[PDB]
Amino acid sequence: DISAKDLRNIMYDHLPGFGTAFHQLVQVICKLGKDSNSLDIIHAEFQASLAEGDSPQCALIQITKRVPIFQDAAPPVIHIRSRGDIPRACQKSLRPVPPSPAIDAGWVCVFQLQDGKTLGLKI
Ligand SMILES: [Cl-]
Incomplete structure (x- = not known):
């Protein structure tokens, strides 16, 4: 099973810069994901957005809108x-x-x- 650390690193891999607001959002998404046993869907949503041609920034914002724990x-x-x-x-x-x-x-x-x-x- 994908861990919070694994997922944070995967997401960070696609982001430009260092310590941007998107880096903080990755932390936030992974912590709330962990605590709601939702790391799998979050990862799948992230990968799917990338596969459809979205930027990693867009993919992260889409998570906040499409994964129901963030509602x-x-x-x-x-x-x-x-x-x-x-x-x-x-x-x-x-x-x-x-x-x-x-x-x-x-x-x-x-x-x-x-x-x-x-x-x-x-x-
Ligand atoms: Cl990390």
């Missing part, structure tokens, strides 16, 4: 010390956290800083 799912909250701990390639995708953020609306995660600040990661 109106709130972004996970990732605790960090400061804004500088968030990778460089994500910094410009950080926003004030909206009302009702959802992963299937492009809110990948919410970072919560030691000092209580919070930032949503938007695609």
